[PDB]
Structures are given as C-alpha cells and as structure tokens.
Paper text:
Reversal of PARylation is predominantly carried out by poly(ADP-ribose) glycohydrolase (PARG) in nucleus and cytosol, whereas ADP-ribosylhydrolase 3 (ARH3) may play a role in mitochondrial PAR degradation. PARG comprises an N-terminal regulatory/targeting domain and a C-terminal catalytic domain. The mouse PARG catalytic domain has a bean-shaped structure, with the active site in a deep cleft in the middle on the abdominal side.
Interestingly, while E748N and E749N mutants were completely dead, both E748Q and E749Q mutants still retained residual PARG activities. PARG E748Q and E749Q mutants have very similar conformation in the active site, consistent with the fact that glutamine has the similar size of side chain with glutamate. In all above four PARG mutant crystal structures, we were not able to observe the electron density for iso-ADPr at the “active” site of mPARG. For the E748Q and E749Q mutants, this may result from the partial catalytic activities of these mutations and/or the low affinity between PARG and iso-ADPr. This secondary binding site is at the mouse PARG exon 5 coded region, and is not formed due to crystal packing as it is far away from any PARG region involved in crystal packing. There are four residues (R478, D480, F491 and T493) directly interacting with iso-ADPr.
Residue numbers in the entry: 442 to 515, 524 to 956
Write the structure that this text describes.
C-alpha cells in the first residue's frame, strides 16, 4: 500500500523557535508601529498600552475608531456615547442585542437581517447555554468593547497598497477591537457606496447574523468560543501584522538556485503538523475572504480558528499581485471538522506554542491569494505562471534574514478545486518559489495519496537531474508553447508532469 509521507523526514525541517534569529529589542520605527509599552512587557502579564491615555487620529491614514470624538450621529452628538448607552443594557432575548446594535446603525435597520442570530440563540443553543451567553459572555464582550479607548490608545495606521510596514499589537488590544466589530461599531465600514474603505474587507460582524444558512451557527460557535476564552482569562501575548510588497522578483527563466528539500504527505494539517513553520493561508486578496459574511472555504477557515487574524481586515487594504500579509503570534482557539457545507465546530483548542522574546506565539501565517481560473488553460500562460510564482515568493521571502534561520514552508493545494487551480502545477510553482526564497517545503495533500506520490516523484526527478529553477521554468514555457497555446479543448492531451519526464528523457 501507499505510504503516509515521502521525502525529507519532517523532523529534519527547520522550525521556530529553534531556527529563529536573535530578535533585536522591540521598538517603534518608521516601518514599525508598536502599540504597547515595550519597557513594561513581561511574560504572563497583560501588556500596557502606549501612549498611557487615548490619542485620536481621524484621517485617511489611520483606522477611524468608534471611540473618536469626531465620530458623530444625529444636533450632531457623540456616537460613542450612544454606543455606550445602547450596549450597557441587559439582554435576555436576541431582539435585545439586535435593537441595541441598531441604535447606532439606524440607516441599516431594514437592511440588516438578524435571523441567524435569533435562530442560534433560540434554536441551536440549549436554554442554559443561552443564559450563559447573555448573562456572562455578552456583558463581558461589551465590557472590553467599551474599554477600547483605554486599551487601544495609539492610532492604528492603515496598511495601504505598496506599504512595507508592521503593526505590533497585544492580543488584549485585538480582543477589544474584535468585540467592537461584533457589535458593529466601526464607522464608515457599512455602506455599499462607501468610498474610502471600498478597497478594504468588511470588519463589522453584521452579515454573520443574516439569513437561514446552516453555516452561521457553526461560525458563531467558533467565534463565541474565542470571546469566551479571552473574557474569562485575558491573553498576554503580542501579534505582529506585516504588509510586504516587493517590486523586484527573480529572473525566473535564468534563476540558478537549486531546488530545496521536500516533505510531502496525504495525512496531517497545515495548522496542526506545520507547527513552527511558515503556514500558508490560501487567501482572498481581501484577507479573510468572506469570513464575516457567508464564506466558509479555504479562504475563510483559518481566520475562524485563529480569529485574531480577523482584526487584520480592519486595517489591511486589498492585496495587489506583488503583496502579502504576514501574521506572527496568533493563537488557535478552535478545532473544526469538514469544509463548506460540512464545516462544523468541534471543540475549543488550547494553543500550547512557545513565545518568542517579543511575547509572540511561535506561529507564523502568510496570506497569499492565488488567482481564480475560470478557464483552465489560462494558468499555463507564462504571464500567469509568473504571477503565481511572484505571489508565492513574496509570501516566502524574508529580506535580511539568513536562509538557515528560516523555517520550512508548510503548504498545500493553493487555489485549486473550485477556484480552478491545477494541483500539480501549483505544487511545482510553490516548490520553485520556495527554492528561490531558499526555504524547504512541507506539502500537505489532504487525503490525495496519488498526488503525494506524483509531487515527490517529480521533485526527486528534477532534483536528481540537477535542474535549477530556471531549467524547470523553461520546461513550463515549452509545455505552454507545445501543448497549451494552440489547444482547442479545455485541457491538453499530454499532462504537465508526463511532459516534463519525456522532455528531459528525450533530451
Ligand atoms: N511603544 C512605544 N512607543 C513609544 N515610546 C515607547 C514605547 N514603549 C516604551 N516607550 C518609551 O520608552 C521608555 C523606556 O525607554 P528605555 O527602555 O530606553 O528606558 C518608556 O518610558 C516610554 O516612554 C514613554 O512612556 C511613558 C508614558 O508615561 P506618561 O506619559 O503616562 O507619564 C513616558 O515616559 C513616555 O516618554
């Protein structure tokens, strides 16, 4: 029978914290916003905010905070005071939460449906679970939500396109912001015809409450698990959000870098078995995809189980082709089973990972968006091969960091299935990109054992015949020109891997 894994033994791959560089002291710079007191940062203690007291910026370079005094509502009065007054009330029934949220969202009183929240509260939860929800969890969420100005004292810059910039933030700060998103308090993030934020993903959680989909109660469970944890016990770690945008990329056709090591397996998960490795989030260019709406596929799932990722939607503009988002220090709060319609919340997860010197859990996630291919052959066009290579490379490269201090890339079938990607091409693309970035690859095929074998066989062949990135890229070009360009059927008669074997063996 087929084996469970092939290639380099996974324990020989590099992983954090062991492989990590010595971190320099944490400090703010022009490229790094730090919202906590670094001199007061201690293990197991909730970080203190810097500055000591709330400072406001209401402009096109920073998040528009709900607690801003320039956040106004019909005389024009303080919307924050109206938020406070509406949410500092007792909820016994789901309509009470709905009505509270709608007091400072009156324009959406008709357009925001709450059927899934009502159903969740009254049909899915048992009586005692609901009491707990409205007697403990919801008041505790309101509490940290209204402390926003005491917790998030420093303005948060928007990570716009082209910026190479980092925001480091406490998990406690993220909790207060995510509580605010739940209660839908973020201004200028709601309208269809919104201008300033149309290039940003949704942050407010309103669409989690709408419609009759069975996906919603599973999403709400997942999120209330998170809110329960961080209100019962305040998290003490930091998380770093980094936008990375590269203008220059390898000259793929002539790249002389050799292929790196591979571990490929049809069992295991990226988040479970890629511990301490760069974990690829198969993202939407709007990071988190439809996580706060109806989406529940590869683009959303990691944002649910590591819900601190969701906060990135507050300040991360849509990714361009040459961009990615790197998140360090998020915690896994939930386990799940299934996918899409079969997604279900299994149980809470106790993340047991170590922390680095900046008190960030040794978990690194990179969101990179593949293209969607609505015509299958489009992805073999060299220009599209290059686009994916460059996207993956941007996700993997760490300017300034020696390669020996880089963990393996933990990845899988990026943008395949219903998104249109070919698994075997995308595997080879990620292998080539990892080679250029001088990282090893741990590839999870999620049940597909023939694919595990085919990937390994190809990697072994190319490695043994000493084909560098450029030679392999040249074979991709030959495959395009000889089999794809003039192909009048949806797929070509000869496949990619068989073409490569034959071309090398004929040559
Ligand atoms: N994230 C940060 N951003 C900016 N400054 C910071 C940060 N973290 C610490 N500091 C500052 O770096 C200093 C430690 O520097 P050393 O490790 O080299 O010794 C800290 O004192 C911090 O100074 C400021 O925070 C204080 C706020 O106090 P009140 O305004 O409520 O009175 C105040 O002193 C102010 O100047």
């Amino acid at each position: 029978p087929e084996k469970k894994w092939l290639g380099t033994p996974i324990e020989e791959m590099r992983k954090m914290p062991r492989c990590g560089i010595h971190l320099p002291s944490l400090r703010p710079s022009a490229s790094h916003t730090v919202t906590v007191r670094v001199d007061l940062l201690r293990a197991g203690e909730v970080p203190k905010p810097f500055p000591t007291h709330y400072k406001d910026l209401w402009d096109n370079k920073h998040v528009k905070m709900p607690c801003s005094e320039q956040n106004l509502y019909p005389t024009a009065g303080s919307r924050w005071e109206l938020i406070q007054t509406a949410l500092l009330n007792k909820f016994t029934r789901p309509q009470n939460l709905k009505d509270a949220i709608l007091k400072y969202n009156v324009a959406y009183s008709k357009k925001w449906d709450f059927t899934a929240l009502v159903d969740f509260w009254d049909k899915v939860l048992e009586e005692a679970e609901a009491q707990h929800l409205y007697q403990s969890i919801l008041p505790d969420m309101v509490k940290i939500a209204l402390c926003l100005p005491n917790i998030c004292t420093q303005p948060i810059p928007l990570l716009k396109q082209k910026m190479n910039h980092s925001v480091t933030m406490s998990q406690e700060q993220i909790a207060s912001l995510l509580a605010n998103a739940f209660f839908c308090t973020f201004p200028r993030r709601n309208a269809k015809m919104k201008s300033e934020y149309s290039s940003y993903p949704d942050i407010n959680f309103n669409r989690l409450f709408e419609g009759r989909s069975s996906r919603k109660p599973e999403k709400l469970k997942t999120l209330f698990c998170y809110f329960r944890r961080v209100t019962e016990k305040k998290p003490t770690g930091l998380v770093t959000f980094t936008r990375q945008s590269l203008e220059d990329f390898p000259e793929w056709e002539r790249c002389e870098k050799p292929l790196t090591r591979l571990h490929v397996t049809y069992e295991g998960t990226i988040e479970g078995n890629g511990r301490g490795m760069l974990q690829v989030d198969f993202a939407n260019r709007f990071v988190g995809g439809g996580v706060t709406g109806a989406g529940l596929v590869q683009q959303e799932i990691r944002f649910l189980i590591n819900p601190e990722l969701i906060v990135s939607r507050l300040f991360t503009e849509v990714l361009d082709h040459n961009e990615c988002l790197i998140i360090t220090g998020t915690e896994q709060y939930s386990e799940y089973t299934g996918y899409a319609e079969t997604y279900r919340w299994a149980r809470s997860h106790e993340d047991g990972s170590e922390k680095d010197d900046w008190q960030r859990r040794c978990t690194e996630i990179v969101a990179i968006d593949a293209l969607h291919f609505r015509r299958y052959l489009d992805q073999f066009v060299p220009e599209k091969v290059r686009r994916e290579l460059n996207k993956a490379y941007c996700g993997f490269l760490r300017p300034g960091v020696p390669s020996e201090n880089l963990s393996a890339v933990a990845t899988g079938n990026w943008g395949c299935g219903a998104f249109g990607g070919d698994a075997r091409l995308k595997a080879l693309i990620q292998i080539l990109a990892a080679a250029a970035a001088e990282r090893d690859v741990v590839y999870f095929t999620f049940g597909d054992s023939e694919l595990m074998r085919d990937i390994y066989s190809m990697h072994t062949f190319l490695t043994e015949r000493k084909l560098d990135v450029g030679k392999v890229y040249k074979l991709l070009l030959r495959y395009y020109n000889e089999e794809c360009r003039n192909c009048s059927t949806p797929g070509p008669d000869i496949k990619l891997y068989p073409f490569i074997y034959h071309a090398v063996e004929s040559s």
